[PDB]
Amino acid sequence: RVKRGVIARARHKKILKQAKGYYGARSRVYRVAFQAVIKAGQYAYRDRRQRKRQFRQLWIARINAAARQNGISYSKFINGLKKASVEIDRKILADIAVFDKVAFTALVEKAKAAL
Amino acid sequence: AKHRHARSSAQKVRLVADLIRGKKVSQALDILTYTNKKAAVLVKKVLESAIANAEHNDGADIDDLKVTKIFVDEGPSMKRIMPRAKGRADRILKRTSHITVVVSDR
RNA sequence: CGUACACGGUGGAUGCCCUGGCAGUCAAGGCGAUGAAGGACGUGCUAAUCUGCGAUAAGCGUCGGUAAGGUGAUAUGAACCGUUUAACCGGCGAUUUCCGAAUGGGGAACCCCGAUCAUUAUCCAAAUGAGGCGAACCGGGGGAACUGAAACAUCUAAGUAC
RNA sequence: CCGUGAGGGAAAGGCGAAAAGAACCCCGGCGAGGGGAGUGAAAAAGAACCUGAAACCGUGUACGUACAAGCAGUGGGAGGC
RNA sequence: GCGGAAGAUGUACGGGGCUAAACCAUGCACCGAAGCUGCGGCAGCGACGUUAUGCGUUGUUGGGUAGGGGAGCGUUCUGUAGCCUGCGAAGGUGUGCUGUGAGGCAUGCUGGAGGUAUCAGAAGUGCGAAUGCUGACAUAAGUAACGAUAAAGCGGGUGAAAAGCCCGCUCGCCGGAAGACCAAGGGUUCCUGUCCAACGUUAAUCGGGGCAGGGUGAGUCGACCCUAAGGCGAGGCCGAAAGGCGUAGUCGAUGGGAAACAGGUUAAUAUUCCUGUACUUGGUGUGUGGGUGAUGGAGGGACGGAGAAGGCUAUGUUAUGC
RNA sequence: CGACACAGGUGGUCAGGUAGAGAAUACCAGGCGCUUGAGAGAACUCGGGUGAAGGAACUAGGCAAAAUGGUGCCGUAACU
RNA sequence: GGCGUAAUGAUGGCCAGGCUGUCUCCACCCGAGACUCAGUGAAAUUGAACUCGCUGUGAAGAUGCAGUGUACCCGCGGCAA
RNA sequence: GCCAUUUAAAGUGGUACGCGAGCUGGGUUUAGAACGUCGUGAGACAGUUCGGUCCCUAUCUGCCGUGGGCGGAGAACUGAG
Q1: How many CA atoms lie within 13 A of B66 on its CB side?
Q2: Å from A58 (CA) to G66 (C1')?
Q3: What one-character DSSP code corresponds to residue B4?
C-alpha cells in the first residue's frame, strides 16, 4: 500500500556516487556496495593519520643524512638545536635539508657550537 | 536515402554503421566493402543511396557531403517459430534494425 | 575489452489521473406448471462482441411526463424517423412461434400426449393438491474426525462440519 | 487458455482543445529496414501514443590499454595530458 | 662437536650477504603502534553545587560477536499557526554547502503540476543477504541442433528477386506400399480470384497460409425406425429417501434394418444432376380380380466348427490370331 | 490421437499386373522427389562389410560374428 | 514331502568337432558428416578476481598461505589432469 | 590360495589403498525368485545364489601440436636451452 517513496530507489543513489576512485564493479552495482564501503568508514575507521608517526621514519632518520657531511649527526645534531636560540621545531626542518643545498647547514654550524 | 522493412537484428546491425559515422563520404565507400560481416550489405545500399537524392533534390555537392548522424534502434518484434534442438517448439523474439544515414554538407 | 557520461533505442518503474474495487450505512425484499430462474438459439442496412429483445426480435400499443432532436455502447458509410410532436423517463395494457421443471412416451432442444402419487368423486381425472427454484436466516431429526488433555480409552473439539 | 470430468483460471488502463496517430519525396526485393519532413500545448506526443527510471544495447566522448598481479584505498612526493 | 641417519620434475637463514651484517653472555642510542607525553575537538559511571539527566569543576577517560539499553533521520494523511508556485512545484539526473551521522539545503538541466516549514497528533512508516514470490534483463552464444522415401541435375518460361513456382528432357524413389476406395475422428482445411504483414525449422511472384466469393441438388446411399448383454420409469414390498429383489411398458449397436443399375456431364458435386431403364412402400381407384388382420408361435434370422470335390467368372496366356 | 506439418499409435476392401518354390527381389499402371545447403581425399565414432597365421587364448557365459543351412537319391543311433 | 526322472524348456555350469576377430595388432575404402562458405537461427550453463613457475608450509601432494623467481597478445585442433 | 608347463631376472612401495567429467563391471548395498537359518508369520538374516541402468555439445586453467600479430617487411640461415 504505502508507496515506497524517496526511500529505496532513492537509496541505490545517494550511494555509489562518492567513489571517485571506484573499481570495476563496487560502483555499478549496489550489492557490491555497502560492503565495499562498509570496509570504508572502517579499515582505517579513524586511522591516513597513520602516516604521522609512521612515515615520519625520515625527518628523524635523514637528519643524520643531512649531517654526517659537515660533522657529526643525529646524536648531537638535535641536542644543540634546543640549546641556544629560540629553538625551532623540527617539522619543515629535517625535510628541507635534502631538497636544497642551503639552510641545511644553517643548523649544523648552529649546533656543534655552544655545545 | 534512409531505412524501412527488413528482418535484421539491430544488435549486429551496427558496428558497420560505425567507422562510417565520421566525415568524408568517400571514406564510407572505400570501407564497408570488406567487412566479413552480414552487417555490410543493406547498410551499404544506404549511405550510398543516402548520398543519392542528396545530389538531385535537396541540392548538395558530393565533394563536400559527409556523414553526420547514423543510429540503429527499432523493430518491432515478432513471433517466429524457429524449430531448434532435436525437436521442440519456441517463439523467436527476433527484432529488426534501423540504419539511419545523413550525408549532408559538413 | 575495463569504467563514467553523452545522444538514440529497448523496457517499463515512477509522478499524476482513473469511467473499478473494498468497507460501512439507510431503504427495500421473493419468483413459478396463467410453465419462472437459468440456458440454448434468433433479432439492427452492414455489426464479429456486449446490451436490449425475441420472430409485430436492441421493438409494438395506451396514458402521463418530456422535448427537438432523435435511430443502445462505436463520435463510420448509407440511411430513417420526428410538429399526424418522436427520442428519452415512469406505469400499465396487447401480443408473445417451437422446444423447454411440461407430466403421455422416447430423446444430448427432436417426434406422438394431463405421467406418477393422493383427496373428493356425478368415480367421468370430472373438480383439486403434490412433484421445481431461491443469499443467508429459522424449525424438526441423523450425527463424526483430525485436534485439545503438548500419549490416551471418560472428557474436549461437537452437539460443530456434513 | 488447461483438464475426460468435478474443477482450475490470467495478462492487457490514459494521445489530445480538436483531429493528428506519420501525408509527400529518396532508397531498397518489398504496404516487412528511414534520412528528411511534418504533427505538439505543459503531449522533453504518432496508432498498447502522457511522464517514462534501473538492468541493458548501440554510437560517440573522457581515459587506460597486447609485462601485466590482483579489494584495485590512504598519506607523502614527483609526471603528463 | 661427532658415528648411529638412503628415496623422490631445480638445492640455500625472508633475500643480499655477513667472521660477524652469525651465535652466545651483556649494554647503549634510535626507526618503529591508532601505545606513552603534548596542542585543538568526546562517551559512560561516581563526587561537588543545582529543580536540572541544563551548565562549571573534579576522579575514572573511551576495542568488541551473541545480547541488553538509548538517540536518529527518510515517510503518508488528516490539526493550529503560518508560507511557497506555471517571472513554475513535486519527481528525476549532475553538482555546491552544512551536520559526528541519520539528512537538511542550494545551483544548473528537466519536469511542469502542486508542494512545505513550526508545534501537534498519526500510518499497512522507513529493507542488500527465506534452493523466498512475480515480472524484466545481462554474461553465457551469435555457441549447440536439422541423420534409409539419403535425387536431384541440365536448359527454358515468368518475375524488380527464383537452388526447391511453372515447362521439356534426363536421372530415381514406392508397389499392401508415398497407389485406389472407406470407418472413426477432424471439419470446410475443397474450388476460383486477389495477395502475403502473420504461418510454412531458408526464399517464395507457391500454399492445406490472409481476404472475398462459389461448391456438398436422392423415395431405392447413410440418418431417421427396432432390438441383444443390459438399463430405466410405473405399480408391489422394506425409519426415510434422488436407496433395492419379481410383473406390465419402454429404452439400448449408421449392427438389425422394405426398394436401381448403366452411362453422360462440371473449374469444384452425384448409384442425389441429366438420359435410359429397373424397383419398393403407403394411399386411392380404372381394370383385372371377386376377402380385407397388432402381439407369442413357423420357415425364416442362430445358414456353427473342421476337411474337402466338382462348376466357375472376367482376366491372363498358347496363337508374333483379329 | 500423442502440446507442433513428433521416423510413435490407428479398423475394413484391392494379396491373380509381369517373370519363382509363395500376397519374396527387378519392373508397367498410379503417385511422388515435403524428411535445409556449398567447398576440403585430418585426428577424431557411431552404422557396415572381413582379414595373411593361430584361433576363444578374450569373456561370468563364444555375448557378438560366422558357419551348416533349396531340391532329389542313398542312408540314419541311444531312447520311447 | 524326500528320492529320482523320458520329451520339452530364449533356464544355470561344463567339454569336443567345425567355424568365427571375440582376442594377440591391426589397412583403407563406401554411404551420410565433420574442416571452410550463402541463408535461416534457440536452449542449457557463471560470487569476484584470475598467465604462473620452483620450494617450503598447511589435516604431512592448494594456482589464490610464506619466500623467491617468473610471466608477450590473440587464435585453431585434440586427449582431456 | 590347489596346480601346470616356461622363465638368466622376472622385487617393493606412494601418488585422496593414483587413475570410472578415460574404459571395462565381471563384485557389493534395489523391484522377481530359490535355499538355509530365525519366526506361528509376513517377513528376516552386513548367509549365499541366478537376472538387473552408472550421465554432460569444458567456459577457464594445464599439457601435447599447428598459425596469425606485435619489435618496417621478402628470402636464406643460426640457434641458448
Answers
A1: 9
A2: 29
A3: -
| Cα distance between residue B45 and residue A72, in whole Å | 86
Distance CA A13, CA A17 (A): 7
Q: Which residues of B are annotated as a binding site?
A: 86
Is the Cβ atom of B87 within 7 Å of strand F at any atom? yes
Distance B62 CA to C153 C1' (A): 107
Nucleotides of D under 7 A from a protein CB: 25-36, 54-60, 71-76, 78
C-alpha cell at B31: 570501407
Q: Is the CB of A88 under 7 A from strand E?
A: no
Round to a whole number and report the distance in Å from the CA of A44 to the C1' of E54.
Answer: 36
Using CA atoms of B87, B93, B98, B99 in order, give the dihedral in degrees to the nearest 10.
-30
Other C-beta atoms closer than 10 Å to the C-beta of B83 total 9
Rounded CA gap, A102 and A91, in Å? 17
How distant, in Å, are the alpha carbons of A46, A106, B92 from that of B84? 60, 88, 10
Nearest to A85 by CA among A60, A66, A107, A64: A107
